């Protein structure tokens, strides 16, 4: 069965490369050395009508929409996914996409800031934290997560499987048929265990540490949805992309 697990790993890696433009390898090549830096209002304007914090938030929303599209195309590649009840496919995407967004965002981050506009720019962490309340608090938890997540030193081949494991989560609210989802996830987990033990002999308990990050991701997502509720009321000027609205509705 090890050959079947390696074949699954390779299939997922190939699909990941096909689906996601700015991979961790490409990001890390940029981040280690050139992007323009956004670190203040002036550089923002040179980098680039509504208030500054809102303009940035709207930018983040459009990037998320592109990510939902890419993640969904990836999901379709996971063997068995499109043979699930379609209601459950939709539920898995609804609840999975944000977890995956924040996982993959860590690839674009270091402790000092985040790559933007396909790796052509870098927005400082300090600048994002400086934004007027409550916008100053959107990205900071993500940076805190990313610093801890990036300390695992995962590569793209590892991430491809981990993201599939997240999508095939049988504990999502509203699933109709949990057992076939868990059957797929069990195979994915076996593939991830093998991939990590192969690729990272220096860290025998990496599998454990990585899976424990799923708890972190869910907390980040919970907190994010809460900050949107706040914004929803008083920011009559924010405008939520209609796709993201679909995801957030009754989440």
């Amino acid at each position: 069965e090890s050959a079947d697990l390696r074949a699954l790993a390779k299939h997922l890696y190939d699909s990941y490369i096909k689906s996601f433009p700015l991979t961790k390898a490409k990001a890390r090549a940029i981040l280690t050395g050139s992007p323009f830096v956004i670190y203040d209002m002036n550089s923002l304007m040179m980098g680039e009508s509504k208030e500054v914090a809102i303009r940035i938030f709207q930018g983040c929303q459009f990037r998320s929409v592109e990510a939902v599209q890419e993640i969904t195309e990836y999901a379709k590649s996971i063997p068995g996914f499109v043979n699930l009840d379609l209601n459950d496919q939709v539920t898995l995407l609804k609840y999975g996409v944000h977890e995956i967004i924040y996982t993959m965002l860590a690839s674009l981050m270091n402790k000092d800031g985040v790559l933007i506009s396909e790796g052509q720019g870098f927005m400082t962490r300090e600048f994002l934290k400086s934004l007027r309340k409550p916008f100053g608090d959107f990205m900071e938890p993500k940076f805190e997560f990313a610093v801890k997540f990036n300390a695992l030193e995962l590569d793209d081949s590892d991430l491809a499987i981990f993201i599939a494991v997240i999508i095939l989560s049988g504990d999502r609210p509203g699933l109709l048929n949990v057992k076939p989802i868990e059957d797929i996830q069990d195979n994915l987990l076996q593939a991830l265990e093998l991939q990590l033990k192969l690729n990272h002999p220096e860290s025998s308990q990496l599998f454990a540490k990585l899976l424990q990050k799923m708890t972190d991701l869910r907390q980040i997502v919970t907190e994010h949805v809460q900050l949107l509720q706040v914004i929803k009321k008083t920011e009559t000027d924010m405008s939520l992309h209609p796709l993201l609205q679909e995801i957030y509705k009754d989440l």
Partner: peptide, 17 residues
């Protein structure tokens, strides 16, 4: 294809399907 929540997931379903 169609599913129970088609009307409230029209954009996500366009992507998937």
């Amino acid at each position: 294809x169609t599913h129970k929540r088609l009307x409230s997931a029209x954009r996500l379903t366009x992507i998937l399907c």
